[PDB]
């Protein structure tokens, strides 16, 4: 059973800058003290990301956006609202659907032909007499039908909490769809009460390499709502950006982890740094390989 709880408020998406976010490890080999150059789907530095936040002010919004080539995800978290996604192509009818979910202790991955209503949510019920809270609710899909794939593992979204103060749980994700393999990268970084993508660097670790092979064009993010304007609750804000085919140059530190990445298509200084393969450049003339224009 599902219900028309839209209460959608229309506001323009406040485009904001990520400042050198969205880079991951391109390969599964331990290098160190090297400047390996790679060409892969990466979020470009100083790129427009979409600040989506449906809360504060009964403002609820959760539109269907295009997976394009990849989807950089962030989830500055306060009270565990973002619970998963429903990647797919049509998200209804007779087509194949993906229902990436992060449960209370595990991660359930199902690629199947689910039917979806317009406003999917996960509803948690709290009782006074027994106090047990159960996820025994399913309103993202009405039912499931002629199903193909199921996967249970350790959950992606991990607390990493217990520490105090102003630090926040910034949860980063990278989704890409290549050779029918939905690759998922993630890392979690504490941030000292920042209201914007932090000024630092990220190293997104590989999590799963799912052998799915399904068409994914219009993805969407699940949320969790309590019971209690029926079925409303929480507080959340997340940020979505898209990966494009670019070229980066990564410098590896002495621990084997990346320190900083120098893009090859934003600034003339970065193009010269890319075409000379070094992170320090002196004064002079540096002929640059051509990455400025793409037809």
């Amino acid at each position, epitope marked *: 059973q599902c219900v028309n709880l839209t209460t959608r408020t229309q506001l323009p998406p406040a485009y904001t800058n990520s400042f050198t976010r969205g880079v991951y490890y391109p390969d599964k080999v331990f290098r160190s003290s090297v400047l390996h150059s790679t060409q892969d789907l990466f979020l470009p530095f100083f790129s427009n990301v979409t600040w989506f936040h449906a809360i504060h002010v009964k403002r609820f919004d959760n539109p269907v956006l295009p997976f394009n080539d990849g989807v950089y995800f962030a989830s500055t978290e306060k*009270s*565990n609202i973002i619970r998963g996604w429903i990647f797919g192509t049509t998200l209804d009818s007779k087509t194949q659907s993906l229902l990436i979910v992060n449960n*209370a*202790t*595990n991660v359930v991955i199902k690629v199947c032909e689910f039917q979806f209503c317009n406003d999917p949510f996960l509803g*948690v019920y*709290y009782h006074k007499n*027994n*106090k*047990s*809270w*159960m996820e025994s609710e399913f309103r993202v899909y009405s039912s499931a039908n002629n199903c193909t794939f199921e996967y249970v593992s*350790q*959950p992606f979204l*991990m*607390d990493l*909490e*217990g*520490k*105090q*103060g*102003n630090f926040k749980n910034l949860r980063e994700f990278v989704f890409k769809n290549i050779d029918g393999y939905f690759k998922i990268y993630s890392k979690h970084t504490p941030i000292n009460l920042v209201r914007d993508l932090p000024q630092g660097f990220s190293a997104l670790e590989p999590l799963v390499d799912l052998p799915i092979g399904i068409n994914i064009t219009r993805f969407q993010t699940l949320l969790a709502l*309590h019971r209690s304007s029926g079925w409303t*609750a*929480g507080a959340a804000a997340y940020y979505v950006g898209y990966l494009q085919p670019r070229t980066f140059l990564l410098k590896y530190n002495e621990n084997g982890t990346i320190t900083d990445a120098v893009d090859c298509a934003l600034d003339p200084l970065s193009e010269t740094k890319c075409t000379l393969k070094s992170f320090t450049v002196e004064k002079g003339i540096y002929q640059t390989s051509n990455f400025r224009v793409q037809p």
Partner: antibody
Amino acid sequence: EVQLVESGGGLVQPGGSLRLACVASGFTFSIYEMNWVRQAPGKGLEWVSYITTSGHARYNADSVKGRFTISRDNSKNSFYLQMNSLRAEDTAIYYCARPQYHYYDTSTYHSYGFDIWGQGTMVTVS
Amino acid sequence: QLVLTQSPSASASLGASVNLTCTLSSGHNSYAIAWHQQQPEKGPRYLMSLNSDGSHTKGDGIPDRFSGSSSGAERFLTISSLQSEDEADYYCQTWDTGIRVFGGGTRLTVLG
């Protein structure tokens, strides 16, 4: 009703292995991570180890010399301290307590401090 | 880790007022605590998780008599109109990255 009952006492020479448990009922374990606390006789209580809701373990507090191990069987609705290598100082009460931060929470995260405590068991070791 | 300079013995008259003190290391000035009362020969009882601003989160069966206050990097628990049951051990504990702390306990020999 929330309650934390334990069992698995025993007298052994140092280096022996026993079976400690914290059975509970009346509330969800899936969304509650559990801690362990050690209280030497006449001394202050000191936590030893804990397991998270997902399944990750922390054998911290540097009093455990790689001797204590924690696990959990969510299927059987029970909580075990995977126990081996008891030593002389380990003769103490082992109050197991349930943290206030359940996984489906609101408000500020002034939680993970224990709201309830088990009755505790005395595991005498010499 | 943080150390608690809580007096091993503090006392006052019954029906009077006292103030317990939980001291905390300067490195974690804005850190919060929670108070556990360990009545002797029984289990611990949780009173309040004290915010850095003195806000309250209360356990069952504890009246408004037991209250908490904060000032600087150190913390207080307030008791007014003392009764017979106060002779017990009080433990102030904290949070970290997987590292609880707890304290020596506040054996309290309220004379009366």
